[PDB]
Amino acid sequence: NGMRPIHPGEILREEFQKEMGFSAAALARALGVATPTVNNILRERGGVSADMALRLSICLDTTPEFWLNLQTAFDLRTAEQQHGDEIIGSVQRLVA
Amino acid sequence: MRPIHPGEILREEFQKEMGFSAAALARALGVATPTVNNILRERGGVSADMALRLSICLDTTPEFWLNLQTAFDLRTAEQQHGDEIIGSVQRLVA
Protein backbone atom coordinates (compact mmCIF):
# COMPACT_ATOMS: atom_id res chain seq x y z
CA ASN A 1 0.00 0.00 0.00
CA GLY A 2 2.30 0.45 1.79
CA MET A 3 2.58 1.79 5.33
CA ARG A 4 -0.21 4.25 6.11
CA PRO A 5 0.81 7.94 6.11
CA ILE A 6 0.63 9.30 9.67
CA HIS A 7 -0.49 12.92 9.92
CA PRO A 8 1.08 14.83 12.85
CA GLY A 9 -2.48 15.71 13.86
CA GLU A 10 -3.14 12.01 14.44
CA ILE A 11 -0.25 11.94 16.93
CA LEU A 12 -1.41 15.23 18.47
CA ARG A 13 -4.92 13.81 18.83
CA GLU A 14 -4.28 10.15 19.74
CA GLU A 15 -1.26 10.48 22.02
CA PHE A 16 -1.43 13.98 23.51
CA GLN A 17 -5.09 15.03 23.43
CA LYS A 18 -6.84 11.73 24.24
CA GLU A 19 -4.76 11.46 27.39
CA MET A 20 -4.22 15.01 28.72
CA GLY A 21 -7.84 15.79 27.92
CA PHE A 22 -7.42 19.32 26.53
CA SER A 23 -9.93 21.02 24.22
CA ALA A 24 -8.78 22.53 20.91
CA ALA A 25 -9.32 26.00 22.36
CA ALA A 26 -7.32 25.15 25.48
CA LEU A 27 -4.40 23.97 23.32
CA ALA A 28 -4.64 27.07 21.09
CA ARG A 29 -4.51 29.47 24.03
CA ALA A 30 -1.38 27.78 25.40
CA LEU A 31 0.20 27.69 21.91
CA GLY A 32 -0.50 31.40 21.46
CA VAL A 33 -2.32 30.66 18.17
CA ALA A 34 -5.88 30.88 16.86
CA THR A 35 -8.21 27.97 17.57
CA PRO A 36 -8.98 27.32 13.85
CA THR A 37 -5.28 26.59 13.24
CA VAL A 38 -5.36 23.89 15.95
CA ASN A 39 -8.71 22.65 14.61
CA ASN A 40 -7.15 22.15 11.17
CA ILE A 41 -4.22 20.14 12.48
CA LEU A 42 -6.35 17.89 14.76
CA ARG A 43 -8.64 17.09 11.79
CA GLU A 44 -5.45 16.44 9.79
CA ARG A 45 -6.31 19.14 7.28
CA GLY A 46 -3.46 21.59 7.82
CA GLY A 47 0.24 20.82 8.16
CA VAL A 48 2.63 21.75 10.94
CA SER A 49 4.86 24.75 10.16
CA ALA A 50 8.26 25.53 11.66
CA ASP A 51 6.61 28.19 13.86
CA MET A 52 3.95 25.72 14.99
CA ALA A 53 6.48 23.00 15.72
CA LEU A 54 8.47 25.37 17.99
CA ARG A 55 5.25 26.38 19.77
CA LEU A 56 4.23 22.73 20.23
CA SER A 57 7.66 21.74 21.59
CA ILE A 58 7.49 24.41 24.29
CA CYS A 59 3.83 23.82 25.03
CA LEU A 60 3.90 20.02 25.19
CA ASP A 61 7.54 19.34 26.17
CA THR A 62 8.94 17.84 22.96
CA THR A 63 11.63 18.75 20.50
CA PRO A 64 10.40 20.74 17.51
CA GLU A 65 12.10 18.19 15.20
CA PHE A 66 9.61 15.58 16.52
CA TRP A 67 6.75 17.48 14.86
CA LEU A 68 8.45 18.53 11.60
CA ASN A 69 9.84 15.02 11.10
CA LEU A 70 6.29 13.70 11.50
CA GLN A 71 5.23 16.27 8.89
CA THR A 72 7.92 15.40 6.33
CA ALA A 73 7.42 11.64 6.82
CA PHE A 74 3.71 12.13 6.18
CA ASP A 75 4.38 14.36 3.17
CA LEU A 76 6.91 11.92 1.72
CA ARG A 77 4.75 8.85 2.21
CA THR A 78 1.91 10.79 0.56
CA ALA A 79 4.02 11.90 -2.43
CA GLU A 80 5.09 8.28 -2.89
CA GLN A 81 1.54 6.97 -2.69
CA GLN A 82 0.19 9.62 -5.03
CA HIS A 83 3.06 10.20 -7.48
CA GLY A 84 5.64 7.50 -6.73
CA ASP A 85 5.31 5.43 -9.89
CA GLU A 86 5.18 8.49 -12.15
CA ILE A 87 8.37 9.84 -10.54
CA ILE A 88 10.26 6.55 -10.86
CA GLY A 89 9.28 6.38 -14.52
CA SER A 90 10.34 9.93 -15.40
CA VAL A 91 13.56 10.62 -13.45
CA GLN A 92 17.01 9.69 -14.73
CA ARG A 93 19.99 9.42 -12.38
CA LEU A 94 22.78 11.88 -13.05
CA VAL A 95 26.35 10.72 -12.40
CA ALA A 96 27.99 13.26 -14.72
CA MET B 1 23.87 27.57 14.71
CA ARG B 2 23.03 29.59 11.59
CA PRO B 3 20.91 27.96 8.87
CA ILE B 4 22.06 26.02 5.83
CA HIS B 5 19.65 25.97 2.90
CA PRO B 6 19.36 22.61 1.06
CA GLY B 7 20.03 24.42 -2.20
CA GLU B 8 23.49 25.31 -0.96
CA ILE B 9 24.17 21.63 -0.43
CA LEU B 10 22.77 20.90 -3.91
CA ARG B 11 24.86 23.68 -5.46
CA GLU B 12 28.17 23.25 -3.58
CA GLU B 13 28.22 19.47 -2.92
CA PHE B 14 26.59 18.08 -6.08
CA GLN B 15 26.51 20.65 -8.87
CA LYS B 16 29.99 22.06 -8.32
CA GLU B 17 31.29 18.51 -7.84
CA MET B 18 29.74 16.79 -10.86
CA GLY B 19 29.69 19.90 -13.05
CA PHE B 20 26.15 19.61 -14.43
CA SER B 21 24.13 22.62 -15.61
CA ALA B 22 20.89 23.63 -13.91
CA ALA B 23 19.17 22.69 -17.20
CA ALA B 24 20.76 19.24 -17.27
CA LEU B 25 19.57 18.64 -13.69
CA ALA B 26 16.05 19.80 -14.54
CA ARG B 27 16.00 17.54 -17.60
CA ALA B 28 17.10 14.58 -15.46
CA LEU B 29 14.61 15.47 -12.70
CA GLY B 30 11.73 15.84 -15.14
CA VAL B 31 11.00 19.39 -14.04
CA ALA B 32 11.38 22.92 -15.38
CA THR B 33 14.73 24.74 -15.19
CA PRO B 34 13.31 27.66 -13.12
CA THR B 35 12.09 25.09 -10.59
CA VAL B 36 15.69 23.92 -10.13
CA ASN B 37 17.03 27.50 -10.14
CA ASN B 38 14.77 28.52 -7.27
CA ILE B 39 16.44 25.89 -5.08
CA LEU B 40 19.99 26.45 -6.37
CA ARG B 41 19.60 30.19 -5.72
CA GLU B 42 18.04 29.44 -2.30
CA ARG B 43 14.81 31.33 -3.04
CA GLY B 44 12.54 28.34 -2.38
CA GLY B 45 12.47 25.11 -0.38
CA VAL B 46 12.57 21.45 -1.33
CA SER B 47 9.17 19.75 -1.47
CA ALA B 48 8.43 16.06 -0.84
CA ASP B 49 8.01 15.57 -4.58
CA MET B 50 11.30 17.30 -5.37
CA ALA B 51 13.01 15.37 -2.56
CA LEU B 52 11.88 12.09 -4.14
CA ARG B 53 13.09 13.20 -7.56
CA LEU B 54 16.44 14.33 -6.16
CA SER B 55 16.88 11.09 -4.25
CA ILE B 56 16.52 8.99 -7.44
CA CYS B 57 18.59 11.41 -9.51
CA LEU B 58 21.54 11.83 -7.15
CA ASP B 59 21.45 8.47 -5.29
CA THR B 60 20.39 9.94 -1.96
CA THR B 61 17.58 9.26 0.41
CA PRO B 62 14.58 11.58 0.17
CA GLU B 63 14.88 12.23 3.93
CA PHE B 64 18.36 13.65 3.34
CA TRP B 65 16.78 16.61 1.52
CA LEU B 66 13.69 16.97 3.73
CA ASN B 67 15.77 16.93 6.89
CA LEU B 68 18.04 19.63 5.48
CA GLN B 69 14.85 21.59 4.76
CA THR B 70 13.42 20.97 8.25
CA ALA B 71 16.69 22.08 9.89
CA PHE B 72 16.82 25.22 7.74
CA ASP B 73 13.22 26.18 8.51
CA LEU B 74 13.58 25.57 12.25
CA ARG B 75 16.83 27.44 12.57
CA THR B 76 15.37 30.28 10.59
CA ALA B 77 12.20 30.32 12.67
CA GLU B 78 14.21 30.34 15.94
CA GLN B 79 16.44 33.18 14.70
CA GLN B 80 13.63 35.41 13.65
CA HIS B 81 10.61 34.63 15.79
CA GLY B 82 12.22 32.87 18.73
CA ASP B 83 11.69 35.70 21.21
CA GLU B 84 8.13 36.24 19.97
CA ILE B 85 7.42 32.52 20.42
CA ILE B 86 8.92 32.22 23.90
CA GLY B 87 6.95 35.30 24.94
CA SER B 88 3.57 33.94 23.83
CA VAL B 89 3.54 30.20 24.63
CA GLN B 90 2.58 28.59 27.96
CA ARG B 91 3.21 24.99 29.00
CA LEU B 92 -0.16 23.30 28.83
CA VAL B 93 -1.48 22.18 32.16
CA ALA B 94 -2.66 18.59 32.42
Author numbering:
A (entry chain A): 4 to 99
B (entry chain D): 6 to 99
From the publication, what sentences describe this entry?
GraTA (Growth rate affecting Toxin–Antitoxin) is a type II TA module recently discovered in Pseudomonas putida. By sequence similarity, GraTA is most closely related to the higBA TA family. Here we show that GraA does not contain unstructured regions and forms a globular dimer while the toxin GraT contains an N-terminal intrinsically disordered region that is key for transcriptional regulation of the graTA operon as well as for the RNase activity of GraT. GraA binds tightly to the graTA operator and GraT prevents this interaction through steric interference from its N-terminal disordered region.
